[PDB]
Ligand binder design. Structure first.
Ligand SMILES: COC(=O)c1cc(S(N)(=O)=O)c(Cl)cc1S(=O)(=O)c1ccccc1
Ligand SMILES: [Zn+2]
Length: 258
């Protein structure tokens, strides 16, 4: 692809090929808690996932993705700022080259060591991800900040699966998994209108950022970094990082559910 995370094709150069990188609705952002506004219309988040929708784990070169069956509404996100249910599509992570900064979002300028994204599309209004993905109301992503510390045993199915998808394009079945198990105990959240965090950078995402973090150990993060961006047979190139810097708020308000 024409983009990545290296100095030659990374975030600071994505605007040349994707000019919306310099848009007014870009993600991630720093959440300044003193500036958030409470919206009394927000409802709690409700996640209702069916573990039989887990389908496949895929090495996509710059990251890896756990896909869910995309056929019906068996797994949905509801509540929060939404009127419509959104259909679970995938989850994935971002991480950094150091434990010091691997998240995408930051809170009061604090950088976490990784971030979980649980992505959904608006199957009430639209009929495919392809149709929804460029629409302002098309996508919803739950972000969870991951604080380095004790090993998180909830990650073990995912981490154990990585040995079968070492290089770019490899994939393997990944079944019987409810990714709400990866979320924090409480689903208190912030929300703002933003974008996918890598190309094509569409401004189509309602972000739901959990207030509570989850843990991850330094060795678990090293397992992400040990994934390889090259194809099989080519000299091994580790996926050392895949987190975008925070982007200007440009007048948006971050709403708080608490
Ligand atoms: C390869 O794409 C992704 O993995 C991804 C990542 C994000 S992220 N990182 O912003 O959560 C979103 Cl919202 C959504 C997507 S995605 O919906 O799967 C996507 C894919 C191709 C084009 C348009 C949208
Ligand atoms: Zn992401």
């Amino acid at each position: 692809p024409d983009w990545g995370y290296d100095d030659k094709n990374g975030p600071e150069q994505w605007s040349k090929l994707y000019p919306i990188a310099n848009g007014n609705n870009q993600s991630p952002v720093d959440i300044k808690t003193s500036e958030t506004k409470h919206d009394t219309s927000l409802k709690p988040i409700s996640v209702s996932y069916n573990p039989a929708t887990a389908k496949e784990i895929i090495n996509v070169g710059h990251s890896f993705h756990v896909n869910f069956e995309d056929n019906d509404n068996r797994s949905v996100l509801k509540g929060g700022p939404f009127s419509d249910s959104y259909r679970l599509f995938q989850f994935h992570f971002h991480w950094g080259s150091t434990n010091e900064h691997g998240s995408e979002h930051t809170v009061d300028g604090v950088k976490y060591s990784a971030e979980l994204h649980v992505a959904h599309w608006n199957s009430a209004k639209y009929s495919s991800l392809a149709e929804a993905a460029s629409k302002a109301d098309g996508l919803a992503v739950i972000g969870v900040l991951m604080k380095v510390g004790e090993a998180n045993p909830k990650l073990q199915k995912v981490l154990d699966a990585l040995q079968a998808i070492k290089t770019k394009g490899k994939r393997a079945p990944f079944t019987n998994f409810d990714p709400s198990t990866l979320l924090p105990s409480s689903l208190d959240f912030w929300t703002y209108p933003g974008s996918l965090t890598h190309p094509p950078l569409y401004e189509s995402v309602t972000w739901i950022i959990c207030k509570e973090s989850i843990s991850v150990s330094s060795e678990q993060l090293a397992q992400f970094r040990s994934l390889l961006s090259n194809v099989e047979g080519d000299n091994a190139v580790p996926m050392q990082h895949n987190n975008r810097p925070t982007q200007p708020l440009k007048g948006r308000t971050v709403r708080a559910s608490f």
